[PDB]
Design a protein around this ligand. Structure first.
Ligand SMILES: *[C@@H]1O[C@H](CO)[C@@H](O[C@@H]2O[C@H](CO)[C@@H](O[C@@H]3O[C@H](CO[C@H]4O[C@H](CO)[C@@H](O)[C@H](O[C@H]5O[C@H](CO)[C@@H](O)[C@H](O)[C@@H]5O)[C@@H]4O)[C@@H](O)[C@H](O[C@H]4O[C@H](CO)[C@@H](O)[C@H](O)[C@@H]4O)[C@@H]3O)[C@H](O)[C@H]2NC(C)=O)[C@H](O)[C@H]1NC(C)=O
Ligand SMILES: *[C@@H]1O[C@H](CO)[C@@H](O[C@@H]2O[C@H](CO)[C@@H](O[C@@H]3O[C@H](CO[C@H]4O[C@H](CO)[C@@H](O)[C@H](O)[C@@H]4O)[C@@H](O)[C@H](O[C@H]4O[C@H](CO)[C@@H](O)[C@H](O)[C@@H]4O)[C@@H]3O)[C@H](O)[C@H]2NC(C)=O)[C@H](O)[C@H]1NC(C)=O
Ligand SMILES: *[C@@H]1O[C@H](CO)[C@@H](O[C@@H]2O[C@H](CO)[C@@H](O[C@@H]3O[C@H](CO)[C@@H](O)[C@H](O)[C@@H]3O)[C@H](O)[C@H]2NC(C)=O)[C@H](O)[C@H]1NC(C)=O
Ligand SMILES: *[C@@H]1O[C@H](CO)[C@@H](O[C@@H]2O[C@H](CO)[C@@H](O)[C@H](O)[C@H]2NC(C)=O)[C@H](O)[C@H]1NC(C)=O
Ligand SMILES: *[C@@H]1O[C@H](CO)[C@@H](O[C@@H]2O[C@H](CO)[C@@H](O)[C@H](O)[C@H]2NC(C)=O)[C@H](O)[C@H]1NC(C)=O
Ligand SMILES: *[C@@H]1O[C@H](CO)[C@@H](O[C@@H]2O[C@H](CO)[C@@H](O)[C@H](O)[C@H]2NC(C)=O)[C@H](O)[C@H]1NC(C)=O
Ligand SMILES: *[C@@H]1O[C@H](CO)[C@@H](O[C@@H]2O[C@H](CO)[C@@H](O)[C@H](O)[C@H]2NC(C)=O)[C@H](O)[C@H]1NC(C)=O
Ligand SMILES: *[C@@H]1O[C@H](CO)[C@@H](O)[C@H](O)[C@H]1NC(C)=O
Ligand SMILES: *[C@@H]1O[C@H](CO)[C@@H](O)[C@H](O)[C@H]1NC(C)=O
Ligand SMILES: *[C@@H]1O[C@H](CO)[C@@H](O)[C@H](O)[C@H]1NC(C)=O
Ligand SMILES: *[C@@H]1O[C@H](CO)[C@@H](O)[C@H](O)[C@H]1NC(C)=O
Ligand SMILES: *[C@@H]1O[C@H](CO)[C@@H](O)[C@H](O)[C@H]1NC(C)=O
Ligand SMILES: *[C@@H]1O[C@H](CO)[C@@H](O)[C@H](O)[C@H]1NC(C)=O
Ligand SMILES: *[C@@H]1O[C@H](CO)[C@@H](O)[C@H](O)[C@H]1NC(C)=O
Ligand SMILES: *[C@@H]1O[C@H](CO)[C@@H](O)[C@H](O)[C@H]1NC(C)=O
Ligand SMILES: *[C@@H]1O[C@H](CO)[C@@H](O)[C@H](O)[C@H]1NC(C)=O
Ligand SMILES: *[C@@H]1O[C@H](CO)[C@@H](O)[C@H](O)[C@H]1NC(C)=O
Ligand SMILES: *[C@@H]1O[C@H](CO)[C@@H](O)[C@H](O)[C@H]1NC(C)=O
Lengths: 102, 106, 126, 73, 119, 364, 45, 24
C-alpha cells in the first residue's frame, strides 16, 4: 500500500557529470525505512545506503543521500562508466520501479 | 464390489464358515445380516465397540487380510437362511452389500 | 422402535415411486442414519441411500440419478422419490435404522455405525 | 517517593539505605558493593565522608548551563 | 557469505519447480532467507521470507496459495517450491539475507546469491 | 513486595528493547538445563523398533540392555507416529541422530508456578499503571516496586495461556505494524475459557535400563482410542475476535479486518502448542481463524512426547506418560498475530497467527 | 576377557550359582580411588 | 584396527556402533 513513485527521465549524460535521483513515500515514515540499490544489467543488485544516510561496506564515497518524511533523494557526484545502470528505492517490502540513467 | 459363495452346506451340530471378500475390507468393519424368506433382515454381527469388535451369542466373525468369515457355532435348522455381508467402501461415500450366501442344513 | 411405510404399491413403468416412512417409539432419531434398501426376488439386497438429521446425504453411485430422499416432518419421517422407475426393476423395499454409537466428540468424526439395528415391516412395490 | 517532586520542600531516611538492602546473584551483589564503594570513595575524596549534603570550594562556572536559583529550586 | 543457488529450466503449465539457496560459512539459524522476484527488465517483488529455525514463513498476497518455502538446517540449505506455474511467471529469482542481519533493524538486503531465471 | 506510586513522573518505556525478556529466556534455559542433569538419558534406547499398528499410535517392540548388562530383554511400548521416523516396519525415535534425548524426571513437577523478579541493591523497577498503555512511549503515572507480580512462565505458540488480563481495554502492540516480520501481540481484557483433554486411558509401564535409570512408556490403552481435543466456546470467542477486529481497524489505513489460518511450517508453529501436566499438545487452529452463535469450536490435537522446544542443537526431551486421562482448563488472555504483505489491493488485511521466537510469550 | 575375583557373600545377591553385585539395580557403585587416602585427619572449624 | 599399507600412513579398517545401537 506504501506507494513508491519515482521521477521520469532517462538522463542522457556522459561520464564525469552528476545525477540527482528521488523517490517518494506515501506515508510519514522516518529515514530508517528506505534504502537504495544499484540494479546492474543482468547481475546481482547490491546495497549502497540503508537508513537513508548510512553507507555500506565496500562502497566508494561518491554516493550520499538524505531525507525525512517524503521526497527522499540520492546524489552521485562522479558517474564512472559502471554507474550507468538502474537504481531502486526499497521500502519494507515493496521495491521501486527504478529511475534510468543512460 | 463384494462377493461371497452362492451357498454353503453343513450337517446339524457342526460349524459352517461363510466367507466374504472384497477390496475395502482391509480398512473398514464388516457387518453381517440374516434374512429369512419373506421376513425382514435382522442384525447378527454388529460393531458394539471401536476396538474389541465383540459378539454375544453363537455367531462370530474372524478378520484376516481382505476376507471376513462369518462363523456360526452350533448350527440348527432354524439358522437355515441367507447371510449378507456389508462394508462401507474406502471412504464414507456409500454403503454396499454382498451377493448373499444361502446356508442349507443337511 | 417400529418403522411403518405407506405408498401406492401398484406403480407402472415411467412413473415416480413415493414411499414415506413413519418412525415410532424412538427417543433420539438424530443419532441414527436412516437408509433405504431393496430386495427383488432371487437377488441380493441393494442399498439405495441414507440421510441424517444433520442434513448429510449420500446415495448409491449407480442409482442416485433416479432416487432422492426426504427430510424430517416433525413426526420423524423420511421418504424416497424414485423417478423413472421401470417394471424391469421391482422388489421389496425396506426402511432401516443404521444406528450410531458415539464414543467421542461427534464433530471430529468419533462415531461408528452399529449397523441396521431395526427393520420395517416392508412393502412390495412394482 | 519524591521522584516527581520539585527540589524545594528526604535522602538519608528513605533512599540511601536501599543501596545495600547462585553465582549470578552473587555477582550482582558484589557489583552492588563495588558501586557503593565507588560512590562513597568519591564522596570521601570530595570531603563528604559522613554528610550527605556538601558545599564545596569549586565555584559554579557560567558555561555549565547557568540558571538562577528560582528557576532551579 | 557464500550463497550457491541452483539452475533454471522452463516449466510447462501445471509443473512444479524446486529452487534452492544453499548457504555456507555463517550462522544459518539466526538468519532470515528472504526471496525476491525480478520481473524481466522491470521492478522487483517480494516473494516471502522464511525464518529457518522454526520454518515460520510469510508469503505475498499475490502468490499466497501457489508457493511453499521449506528450509533444511542440517545442510543449511533453504528451499522454495513453486507449483502450478503459468507462462506469465517469466522472471528471475534471487535470495537475499537481511532484516537485522546488517546493523539496521529495517530490511537491508546485502548479500545475494546467483540468480535463477525460470521463465 | 512493596509498591509506591510516583506522582508527576513520566518515563519512556519500551517493551521491545527490554532486557528482562532476554534474561528470562536465558534463566529458563539455565533452569531447564540444571533440572534435567540428574535425569535419565535415552541414548541406549536408540535401537531398531519393530512397530505395527495398534490412529497416530504405533505398538513398537524392541530389545534393551537390562540391569544385568550381559542379558538382553525384549519389551513393548506404544509410541505416537510423530515420535518415530522410519529407516517395512523398522523405526527409530525421532531426533536420535541429531540430539541426545533426556527423559523429564518424574517426582519433580514442572508446573509454571508464579515467579517474581526482585531488583538488586542500588537498582529499581518502574511499573507503568496507565491502563491504555500499549507497550511503547510515555506513561501517565508509574510506581517503583521491589518485586514484580507473579509471572507464570507459560509455554505457548499462538494463544497466550494463563497470562495477565488487561484492566480495561484490549491492548495491541508491535514495534512497527507496517513492518511485517514483527509479531503483533494482542491482550484480551476478557478471558476466554478453554477446556482441553487427552481422553485416552493410558497404563504406564516402567522399563529398567540401568543402575537406577527407569524409562516410563505408554502401554495397553484400555477402551476406545479417542482423539485429544481442545474445546473453545463459540460464544465468547468471535465476540472477543470481533472486538479485536474493531480495534485493528483504527491502527491501520481503513480496510476490512479479517483472519486467515496459519501458514506452512513446523507442527511447533502451525498449531497452538503448550504443555498440560507434562503432556505436550499440538492443537490445530484452522477452526478459529476461518470465518456466529453459541456452540463449541472443538480443535483436533496431536500428542508429542519427544519435543525440543527453545531449539538447542543436540538436545531433546522425552516427556513421560501419565495413567488415566487428563484435562486442561486454561484462560486465553492473549493472541499473537502477523500480517501478510504484498500488493494484494482489495482493501482487506489478512492476519495469520504466528509462532516461534519464544521471548514474545514473556514480552506480554 | 574372562577374569576371576573373590567377593564376600554380603557383596553379592543371587538371581544355582549366578549372582550380581549388591545394589546394582538401585545404585551406581563408585570405586573408592586408590592413591588418595580417606584418613579422618583432624578438622578445625 | 585392520591396518595395511597405503610412507608413515596406514589404511585402517574397523567396525563401530553406529547411531542405531543394535547395528554395526
Ligand atoms: C468438548 O465438546 C464436546 C461436545 O462437542 C464434549 O462432550 C463430548 O460429547 C460427546 C457427544 O457429542 C460425548 O459422547 C457421549 O459419549 C459417551 C460414551 O461413553 C464412553 O464411556 C463409557 C465409559 O464408561 C464407555 O462405556 C462407553 O462405551 C464403550 O463401551 C461399550 C461397552 O459395550 C461399547 O459398546 C462402546 O462402543 C464403547 O466402547 C464410551 O467409551 C456416552 O455417554 C454418550 O452416549 C450415551 O449417552 C447419552 C446419555 O447418557 C445418550 O443420549 C446416548 O444416546 C447414549 O446412550 C455419548 O456418545 C463425549 O463423551 C463427550 N466427550 C468426552 C471426552 O467425554 C466434550 O467433553 C468437550 N471437551 C471438554 C474437554 O469439555
Ligand atoms: C493454567 O492454569 C490452570 C489452573 O491453574 C492449570 O490447570 C491445573 O493444572 C494443575 C497442574 O497440572 C492441575 O493439578 C493436577 O491435578 C490432578 C488432579 O488433581 C485432582 O485429583 C486428585 C486425585 O486424583 C486430588 O488429590 C486433587 O486434590 C485434585 O482434586 C493431579 O493429577 C495432579 O497431581 C499430580 O501433580 C502433583 C504436582 O503438584 C503431584 O504432587 C501429584 O503427586 C500428582 O503427580 C495435579 O494436582 C490442576 O488440576 C489443573 N486445574 C484445572 C482446573 O484443570 C493449567 O494447566 C494451566 N495451563 C497451562 C498451559 O499450563
Ligand atoms: C503505541 O503508543 C504510542 C504512543 O503511546 C504510539 O506512538 C505514536 O506513534 C505515531 C507514529 O507511529 C506518532 O504519529 C506521528 O508522530 C509524529 C511525532 O513523532 C508527529 O509529528 C506526527 O504528526 C504523528 O502524530 C504519534 O504521535 C505517537 N504518539 C501518540 C500519542 O499517538 C505508537 O504508534 C503505538 N503503537 C502500537 C504498535 O500500538
Ligand atoms: C495514558 O493515559 C492517558 C489518559 O489518562 C492517555 O491520554 C489520552 O487517552 C485517551 C483515552 O484513551 C485517548 O483517546 C487520547 O488519545 C490520549 N491522548 C494522547 C495524546 O495519546 C495516554 O495516551 C495514555 N498513554 C498511553 C501510552 O496509552
Ligand atoms: C473489555 O473492553 C471492551 C471494549 O471496550 C468492553 O466492552 C464494552 O462493554 C460495555 C459494557 O457497558 C458496552 O457498553 C460496550 O459497548 C462494549 N464495547 C464493545 C466494543 O462491545 C468490555 O466490557 C471490557 N471488559 C471488561 C471486563 O472490562
Ligand atoms: C482404565 O483401565 C484400567 C485397567 O485396569 C481400569 O482399572 C480397572 O477398573 C475396573 C472398573 O470396573 C476395576 O474393576 C479394575 O479392578 C481396575 N483395574 C485395575 C488394575 O486397577 C480403569 O478403570 C480404566 N479407567 C477408565 C476411566 O475407564
Ligand atoms: C479464569 O479466570 C476466571 C476469572 O476471570 C477464574 O475464575 C475464578 O477462579 C478463582 C480461583 O481462585 C475462584 O476463586 C473465583 O471464584 C473464580 N471466579 C469466577 C467469577 O468464577 C478461573 O479460575 C480462571 N481459570 C483458570 C483455569 O485459572
Ligand atoms: C416402546 O418400546 C419400549 C421398549 O421397552 C416398550 O416398553 C414401550 O411400551 C414402547 N412404547 C410404545 C408407545 O410403543
Ligand atoms: C505534583 O505536582 C503538583 C502540582 O500542583 C503538586 O501539588 C504535587 O505535590 C506534586 N507531586 C508530588 C509527589 O510532590
Ligand atoms: C570556566 O569558565 C572559563 C571562562 O574563561 C573557561 O575558560 C573555563 O574553561 C571554564 N571551566 C570549565 C571547567 O569549563
Ligand atoms: C538423520 O538426521 C537427519 C537430519 O540431520 C534426518 O533428516 C534423517 O532422517 C536422519 N536419519 C534417519 C535414518 O532417519
Ligand atoms: C516384528 O514382529 C513380528 C511378530 O510377529 C515378526 O514376525 C516380524 O518379523 C518382526 N519384524 C522384524 C523386522 O523383525
Ligand atoms: C532383540 O533381541 C532379542 C534377543 O533375544 C532377539 O530375539 C530379537 O530378534 C532382537 N530384535 C530386535 C528387533 O531388536
Ligand atoms: C496512578 O496510579 C494509581 C495506582 O494506584 C492508579 O490508581 C491511578 O488511577 C493512576 N492515575 C491515573 C491518572 O490514572
Ligand atoms: C477419565 O477418567 C476418570 C477417572 O476414572 C473417569 O471417571 C472418566 O469417565 C474418564 N473420562 C474419559 C472421557 O476418558
Ligand atoms: C532389585 O532391587 C530390589 C529393590 O529395589 C531388590 O529387592 C531386588 O533383589 C533386586 N533384584 C534382584 C534380581 O536382585
Ligand atoms: C583385514 O582385511 C583383509 C581384507 O582382504 C582380510 O582378508 C583380513 O583377514 C583382515 N584381517 C583381519 C586380522 O581380520
Ligand atoms: C567388524 O564387524 C563386522 C560386522 O559385519 C564384521 O564382519 C567384521 O569382521 C568385524 N571386524 C573387525 C576387524 O572388527
Amino acid at each position: 500500500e506504501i506507494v513508491l513513485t519515482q521521477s521520469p527521465g532517462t538522463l542522457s549524460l556522459s561520464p564525469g557529470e552528476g545525477a540527482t535521483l528521488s523517490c517518494r513515500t506515501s506515508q510519514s515514515l522516518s529515514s530508517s525505512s528506505l534504502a537504495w540499490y544499484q540494479q546492474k544489467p543482468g547481475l546481482a543488485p547490491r546495497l549502497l545506503i540503508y537508513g537513508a544516510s548510512i553507507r555500506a561496506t565496500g562502497i566508494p564515497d561518491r554516493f550520499s543521500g538524505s531525507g525525512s518524511g517524503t521526497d527522499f533523494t540520492l546524489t552521485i557526484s562522479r558517474l564512472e562508466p559502471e554507474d550507468f545502470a538502474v537504481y531502486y528505492c526499497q521500502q519494507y517490502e515493496f521495491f521501486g520501479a527504478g529511475t534510468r540513467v543512460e | 464390489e463384494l462377493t461371497q459363495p452362492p451357498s454353503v452346506s453343513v450337517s446339524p451340530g457342526q460349524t459352517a464358515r461363510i466367507t466374504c471378500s472384497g477390496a475395502p475390507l482391509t480398512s473398514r468393519f464388516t457387518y453381517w445380516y440374516r434374512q429369512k424368506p419373506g421376513q425382514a433382515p435382522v442384525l447378527i454381527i454388529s460393531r458394539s465397540s471401536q476396538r474389541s469388535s465383540g459378539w454375544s451369542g453363537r455367531f462370530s466373525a474372524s478378520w484376516s487380510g481382505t476376507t471376513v468369515t462369518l462363523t456360526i457355532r452350533g448350527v440348527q435348522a432354524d439358522d437355515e437362511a441367507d447371510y449378507y455381508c456389508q462394508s462401507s467402501d474406502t471412504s464414507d461415500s456409500y454403503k454396499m452389500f454382498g451377493g448373499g450366501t444361502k446356508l442349507t442344513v443337511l | 422402535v417400529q418403522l411403518r411405510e405407506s405408498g401406492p404399491g401398484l406403480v407402472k413403468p415411467s412413473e415416480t415411486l413415493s414411499l414415506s416412512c413413519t418412525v415410532s417409539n424412538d427417543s433420539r432419531p438424530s443419532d441414527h442414519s436412516w437408509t433405504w434398501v431393496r430386495q427383488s426376488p432371487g437377488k441380493a439386497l441393494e442399498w439405495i441411500g441414507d440421510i441424517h438429521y444433520n442434513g448429510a446425504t449420500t446415495y448409491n453411485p449407480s442409482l442416485r440419478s433416479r432416487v432422492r430422499i426426504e427430510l424430517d416432518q416433525s413426526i420423524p419421517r423420511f421418504s424416497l422419490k424414485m423417478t423413472s422407475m421401470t417394471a424391469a426393476d421391482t422388489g421389496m423395499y425396506y426402511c432401516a435404522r443404521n444406528a450410531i454409537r458415539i464414543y467421542g466428540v461427534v464433530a471430529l468424526g468419533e462415531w461408528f455405525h452399529y449397523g441396521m439395528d431395526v427393520w420395517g415391516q416392508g412393502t412390495a412395490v412394482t | 517517593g519524591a521522584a516527581g517532586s520539585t527540589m524545594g520542600a528526604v535522602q538519608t531516611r528513605q533512599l540511601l539505605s536501599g543501596f545495600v538492602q547462585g553465582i549470578k546473584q552473587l555477582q550482582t551483589r558484589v557489583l552492588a558493593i563495588e558501586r557503593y564503594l565507588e560512590v562513597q570513595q568519591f564522596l570521601g575524596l570530595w570531603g563528604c565522608s559522613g554528610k550527605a549534603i556538601c558545599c564545596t570550594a569549586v565555584p559554579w562556572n557560567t558555561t555549565w548551563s547557568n540558571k538562577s536559583e528560582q528557576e532551579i529550586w | 557469505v557464500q550463497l550457491v543457488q541452483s539452475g533454471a529450466e522452463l516449466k510447462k503449465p501445471g509443473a512444479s519447480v524446486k529452487v534452492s539457496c544453499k548457504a555456507s560459512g555463517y550462522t544459518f539459524t539466526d538468519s532470515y532467507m528472504h526471496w525476491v522476484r525480478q520481473a524481466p527488465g522491470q521492478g522487483l517483488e517480494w516473494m516471502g521470507w522464511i525464518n529457518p529455525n522454526y520454518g515460520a514463513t510469510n508469503y505475498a498476497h499475490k502468490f499466497q496459495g501457489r508457493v511453499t518455502m521449506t528450509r533444511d538446517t542440517s545442510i543449511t540449505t533453504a528451499y522454495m517450491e513453486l507449483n502450478r506455474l503459468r507462462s506469465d511467471d517469466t522472471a528471475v529469482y534471487y535470495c537475499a539475507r537481511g532484516n537485522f542481519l546488517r546493523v539496521d533493524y529495517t530490511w537491508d538486503f546485502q548479500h545475494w546469491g546467483q540468480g535463477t531465471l525460470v521463465t | 513486595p512493596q509498591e509506591m506510586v510516583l506522582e508527576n513522573v513520566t518515563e519512556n518505556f519500551n517493551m521491545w528493547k527490554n532486557n528482562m525478556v532476554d534474561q528470562m529466556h536465558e534463566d529458563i534455559i539455565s533452569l531447564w538445563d540444571q533440572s534435567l542433569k540428574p535425569c535419565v538419558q535415552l541414548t541406549p534406547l536408540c535401537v531398531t523398533l519393530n512397530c505395527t499398528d495398534v490412529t497416530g499410535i504405533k505398538n513398537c517392540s524392541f530389545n534393551i540392555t537390562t540391569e544385568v548388562r550381559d542379558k538382553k530383554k525384549k519389551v513393548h511400548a506404544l509410541f505416537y507416529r510423530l515420535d518415530i521416523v522410519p529407516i517395512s516396519t523398522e523405526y527409530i525415535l525421532i531426533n536420535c541422530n541429531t540430539s541426545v534425548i533426556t527423559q523429564i524426571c518424574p517426582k519433580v513437577s514442572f508446573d509454571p508456578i508464579p515467579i517474581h523478579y526482585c531488583a538488586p541493591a542500588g537498582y529499581a523497577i518502574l511499573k507503568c499503571n496507565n491502563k491504555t498503555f500499549n507497550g511503547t512511549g510515555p506513561c501517565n503515572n508509574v510506581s517503583t516496586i521491589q518485586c514484580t507480580h507473579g509471572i507464570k512462565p507459560v509455554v505457548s505458540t499462538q494463544l497466550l495461556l494463563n497470562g495477565s488480563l488487561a484492566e480495561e481495554d484490549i491492548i495491541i502492540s508491535s514495534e512497527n505494524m507496517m513492518d511485517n516480520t514483527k509479531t503483533i501481540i494482542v491482550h484480551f481484557n476478557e478471558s476466554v475459557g478453554i477446556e482441553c483433554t487427552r481422553p485416552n486411558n493410558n497404563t504406564v509401564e516402567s522399563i529398567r535400563i540401568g543402575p537406577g535409570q527407569t524409562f516410563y512408556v505408554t502401554g495397553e490403552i484400555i477402551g476406545d482410542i479417542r482423539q485429544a481435543h481442545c474445546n473453545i466456546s463459540k460464544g465468547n470467542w468471535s465476540k472477543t475476535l470481533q472486538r479485536v477486529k474493531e480495534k485493528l481497524k483504527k491502527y491501520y489505513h481503513n480496510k476490512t479486518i479479517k483472519f486467515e489460518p496459519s501458514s506452512g511450517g513446523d507442527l511447533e508453529i502451525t498449531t497452538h502448542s503448550f504443555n498440560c501436566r507434562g503432556e505436550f499438545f499440538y492443537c490445530y487452529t484452522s477452526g478459529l481463524f476461518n470465518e456466529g452463535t453459541n456452540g463449541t469450536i472443538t480443535l483436533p490435537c496431536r500428542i508429542k512426547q519427544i519435543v525440543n522446544m527453545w531449539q538447542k542443537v543436540g538436545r531433546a526431551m522425552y516427556a513421560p506418560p501419565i495413567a488415566g486421562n487428563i484435562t486442561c482448563s486454561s484462560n486465553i488472555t492473549g493472541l499473537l498475530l502477523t500480517r501478510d504483505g504484498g500488493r494484494g489491493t482489495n482493501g482487506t488485511e489478512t492476519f495469520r497467527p504466528a509462532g516461534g521466537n519464544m521471548k514474545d510469550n514473556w514480552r506480554s
